[PDB]
Design a protein around this ligand. Structure first.
Ligand SMILES: CSCC[C@H](NP(=O)(O)CO[C@H](C)Cn1cnc2c(N)ncnc21)C(=O)O
Ligand SMILES: [Mn+2]
Ligand SMILES: [Mn+2]
Lengths: 555, 411
DNA sequence: GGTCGGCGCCCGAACAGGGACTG
DNA sequence: CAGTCCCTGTTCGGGCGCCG
């Protein structure tokens, strides 16, 4: 076997484990002909070699059809070898995006045919990549081969190929620094600002540079004219868009059909603005069977019909001009949902997106907006390497009050207020000083761990009092209930004194939405007030009415 | 032609496998220009995916510094080699460094590149450089010399460093020199002028051996932030309720704090804004509690074997308080910062500045870096903290969410 | 078909660590 | 006192989408 021009990558097995020994799957006769036709062709090209009984290893093998072609793709079920193969560090750190491409005078795309079959495998590791090709007769012993290149299905092949491909492109890109080569596996996006005459030469130079190492660039996959098909998009000289997306129109929806729908909706949200998958993802909660039929809710049918109407109109993104600033604008869509557009010129979106994660049992719009800004910031650094300037639906004075008075550290990068309702705001403000002339409520609540019974109430400075029995409750629920009672029975201004750190900590964070309906009721009462002053005192110290109302709610 | 010092990981532990986080354009261009030049000098060489280890990498600029500085987050590799730089080649910590009138810091990380690294250990120094928009796969490297930011580098170079500093230590015996990570702490009681001159004498003394910049500290002027009680002519029910709760919390630190007579003033269900005259029994309980807060806590002393812990509280208006301790309520030091960079506009820049100042003080006083409890959300911190980092070390930290109780540390 | 690696989303279960009450 | 549980937050396993 001749030596490949590419330097091999030394690969070891994990210490203390041998190669795989798995029996071959029963293959269809139409797939057997495709394998023997490919195996005999790769054997002639030196990519696989015959092996005798001295190789005690074996692994299953199969094949799937290539998309939009009559050719076949050979795949190996290396699930047992991948378990016992050494760990690799993947060099593919992410996926390129067209919104990060800059305008170039010339663009060329070309794919490498049978990319894994042109990069050699480690000589000492080829013995473990043994497989058996079953013949048309079950009594025939079959032909046994071993891989001399990178197999398809082994966990090390993609990491080895990407590093090998980068090493071969280094001498060309070093000699041609003004040539941009987007390298995703074997897909090469080549662009330049050279004149179109000199560009065609450099493309041919690159096709020969790759040819000197065994990498073939077929003229079939060669692309010289726009629109270019690259990474699932359509690249035009002035704009880009995703390749056509098809959503299923099932009359009876299963759980797996929703997962296929939700995934395509997320994929479409990168350029199609306003995609919502809140109500459709609510169909996947608490469900077990992937094939179980589930009916669409009224909120899910409306959300789906809105997404289909957005996908009817054509949308496109633009490319990145480093000479102009990056701008990200966010909108409060639904409760818990946020959308954003990243652009440089008005209505010329580089890309779009959405944020809808619910963090914690109690939150407000300011927290979620801060989380969305961070998600966009990290996303922008990946694509453009910089943080955009933000346009946020929150008053400058609103944000100033929040971050200065909040006990956690928080910050938003350089941003400006855009007046687009609904505007994010704080729905209520706790006073920093006790209110003169307002009734002072001393609240407390307790419960029993066993009987699950408890009391909640208050004692005020005007003699007002209340105690309410509670069933199936906790110490935390009662102490929240006592504050809720003091809010119901007070005027527009009230001073409330509690000893519950748990209850006080939740309210001071100014939540406007909660998983607990009790907290929501507390919120609704807090919004109706004009001045609220909460205050904490230590318990069991005989302080004011806190000791009196503790003995009242003792049982 | 230098012999390598054999280094091993701790028994039953593998190397670091930490994913690289996204980097800005200015940091990637800086890292490429630095790593290309470091490869040209043999300090690093490219590797492949067969190395399963990796450590994050980013770039910083020190205070008033224009040049970018490569920084590797070797925190995970340092945890997995702890027995090396503590048991075998430990570096003693001078107790007099904190008592000097002036202490200057010198970045001597460039000297580590002169010593080769053990061949078997180079596999763990791996790191990957990302690309904008993932134009190319990751460009992986590994170190061929002693890496900056690794706690094994000053331990191996310790023998070489002692012989370089011996001529200077002999001429200047009253000057204290401490080496922590890539930094050199030089402390003296000299006048500012001749002190900075003695620094420049050491700078030229280090240039002739194959090695700049200084950060001045004055540990003698480091002050602590005690627990203070308000001095009011008129007290209200709310004032005394807040006073009792604060004294109740402070009683966990000072066992002599009493709130009996003060709680007796809060017997009735009174309005918060009502003025309450202090009884003479309560006035003495308040004055005696003030006297206790001036005296130090009993049985508080540093333990060399225990980890340092640092808590930070956001007090608003650019105020930031902190306490350093090893056991709860046994604070080895308390303090307060104010008017730092980013005050009244950027909490993360202020918090980043606070962590650096606290870590710097912990190195001078004990020679350790504390683990921080940060009053910030994890995603808020991990999004911006590298934008404001100006130090060659990185402390360990965790994130807490403690809503304010009784403002114990700031009036 | 039920191969691999990357990145993204959604969900629930398992993990985990602090706070107030109890033998 | 240590030992619960009530509560809350984080991490991870697994499905889909997308690319080669
Ligand atoms: C019209 S289908 C695309 C044709 C493609 N081109 P290629 O070989 O140059 C480059 O692909 C390499 C092998 C990556 N890779 C792609 N798909 C798979 C897969 N399913 N399993 C494992 N590795 C895969 C091919 O042949 O796989
Ligand atoms: Mn190809
Ligand atoms: Mn209670």
């Amino acid at each position: 076997v001749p030596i490949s021009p590419i330097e091999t990558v030394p690969v070891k097995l994990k210490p203390g484990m041998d190669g795989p020994k798995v029996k071959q799957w029963p293959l269809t006769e139409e797939k057997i002909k495709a394998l023997v036709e490919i195996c005999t062709e790769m054997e002639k090209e030196g990519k696989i070699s015959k092996i005798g009984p001295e190789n005690p290893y074996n692994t299953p093998v199969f094949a799937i059809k290539k998309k939009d072609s009559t050719k076949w793709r050979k795949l190996v079920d290396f699930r047992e070898l991948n378990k016992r193969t050494q760990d690799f560090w993947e060099v593919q750190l992410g996926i390129p995006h067209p919104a990060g491409l800059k305008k170039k005078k010339s663009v060329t795309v070309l794919d490498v045919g049978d990319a894994y079959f042109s990069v050699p495998l480690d000589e000492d590791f080829r013995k473990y990549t043994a497989f058996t090709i079953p013949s048309i007769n079950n009594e025939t012993p079959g032909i046994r081969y071993q891989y001399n290149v990178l197999p398809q299905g082994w966990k090390g092949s993609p990491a080895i190929f990407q590093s090998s491909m980068t090493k071969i492109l280094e001498p060309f890109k070093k000699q041609n620094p003004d040539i941009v080569i987007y390298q995703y596996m074997d897909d090469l996006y080549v662009g330049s600002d050279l004149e179109i005459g000199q560009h065609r030469t450099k493309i041919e130079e690159l096709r020969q540079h790759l040819l000197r190492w065994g990498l073939t660039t077929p003229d079939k996959k060669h692309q010289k004219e726009p629109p270019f098909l690259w990474m699932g998009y359509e690249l035009h000289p002035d704009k880009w868009t995703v390749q056509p997306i098809v959503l299923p129109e099932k009359d009876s929806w299963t759980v797996n059909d929703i997962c296929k729908l939700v995934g395509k909706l997320n994929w479409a949200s990168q350029i199609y603005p306003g995609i919502k998958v809140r109500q459709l993802s609510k169909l996947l909660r608490g469900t077990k069977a992937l094939t179980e039929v589930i009916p669409l809710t009224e909120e899910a049918e409306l959300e789906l019909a809105e997404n289909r109407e957005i996908l009817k109109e054509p949308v496109h993104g633009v490319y990145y001009d480093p000479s102009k600033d990056l701008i990200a604008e966010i909108q409060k869509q639904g409760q818990g949902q946020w959308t954003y557009q990243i652009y440089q010129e008005p209505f010329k979106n580089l890309k779009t997106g959405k944020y809808a994660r619910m963090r914690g049992a109690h939150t407000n719009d300011v927290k979620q907006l801060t989380e969305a800004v961070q998600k966009i910031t990290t996303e922008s650094i990946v694509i453009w390497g910089k943080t955009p300037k933000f346009k946020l639906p929150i008053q400058k004075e609103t944000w100033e009050t929040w971050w200065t008075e909040y006990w956690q550290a928080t910050w938003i990068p350089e941003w400006e207020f855009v007046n687009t309702p609904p505007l994010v705001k704080l729905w209520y403000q706790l006073e920093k000083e006790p209110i003169v002339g307002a009734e002072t409520f001393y609240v407390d609540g307790a419960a029993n761990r066993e009987t699950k019974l408890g009391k909640a109430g208050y004692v005020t400075n005007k003699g007002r009092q209340k105690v309410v029995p509670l069933t199936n409750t906790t110490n935390q629920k009662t102490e929240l209930q006592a504050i809720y009672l003091a809010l119901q029975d007070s005027g527009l201004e009230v001073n409330i004194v509690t000893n519950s750190q748990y209850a006080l900590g939740i309210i001071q964070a100014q939540p406007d939405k909660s998983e607990s309906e009790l907290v929501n009721q507390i919120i609704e009462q807090l919004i109706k007030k004009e001045k609220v002053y909460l205050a904490w005192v230590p318990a069991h110290k005989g302080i004011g009415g806190n000791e009196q109302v503790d003995k009242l709610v003792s049982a | 032609p230098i012999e390598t010092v054999p280094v091993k990981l701790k028994p039953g532990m593998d190397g670091p496998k930490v994913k690289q986080w996204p980097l800005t354009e200015e940091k990637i261009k800086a890292l490429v220009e630095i790593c290309t030049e470091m490869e040209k000098e043999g300090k690093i060489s490219k590797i492949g995916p067969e190395n399963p280890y990796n450590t994050p990498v980013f770039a910083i600029k020190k205070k008033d510094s224009t040049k970018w500085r490569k920084l590797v987050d070797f925190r995970e590799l340092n945890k997995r080699t702890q027995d090396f730089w503590e048991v075998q080649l430990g570096i003693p910590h001078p107790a007099g460094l904190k008592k000097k009138k002036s202490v200057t810091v010198l970045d001597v990380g460039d000297a580590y590149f002169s010593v080769p690294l053990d061949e078997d250990f180079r596999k763990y120094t791996a790191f990957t450089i990302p690309s904008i928009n993932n134009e190319t796969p990751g460009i992986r490297y590994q170190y061929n010399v002693l890496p900056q930011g690794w706690k094994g580098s000053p331990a191996i170079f310790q023998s070489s460093m002692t012989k370089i500093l011996e001529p200077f230590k002999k001429q200047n015996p009253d000057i204290v020199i401490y080496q922590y990570m890539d930094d050199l702490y030089v402390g003296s009681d000299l006048e500012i002028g001749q002190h900075r001159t003695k620094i420049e004498e050491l700078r030229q003394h280090l240039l002739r051996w194959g090695l700049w910049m200084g950060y001045e500290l004055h540990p003698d002027k480091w002050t602590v932030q005690p627990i203070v009680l308000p001095e009011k002519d008129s007290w209200t029910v709310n004032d005394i309720q807040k006073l009792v709760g604060k004294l109740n919390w402070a009683s966990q630190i000072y066992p002599g704090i009493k709130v009996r007579q003060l709680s007796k003033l809060l017997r009735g269900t009174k309005a918060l804004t009502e003025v309450i005259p202090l009884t003479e029994e309560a006035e003495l309980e308040l004055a005696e509690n003030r006297e206790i807060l001036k005296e130090p806590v009993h049985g508080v002393y540093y333990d060399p074997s225990k980890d340092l812990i640092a808590e930070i509280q956001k007090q608003g208006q650019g105020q930031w308080t902190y306490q350093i301790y090893q056991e709860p309520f046994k604070n080895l030091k308390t303090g307060k910062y104010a008017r730092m960079r980013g005050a009244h506009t950027n909490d993360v820049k202020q918090l980043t500045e606070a962590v650096q100042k606290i870590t710097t003080e912990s190195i001078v006083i004990w020679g350790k870096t504390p683990k921080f409890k940060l009053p910030i959300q994890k995603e808020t911190w991990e999004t911006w903290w590298t934008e404001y980092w100006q130090a060659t070390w990185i402390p360990e930290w965790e994130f807490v969410n403690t809503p304010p109780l009784v403002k114990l540390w700031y009036q």
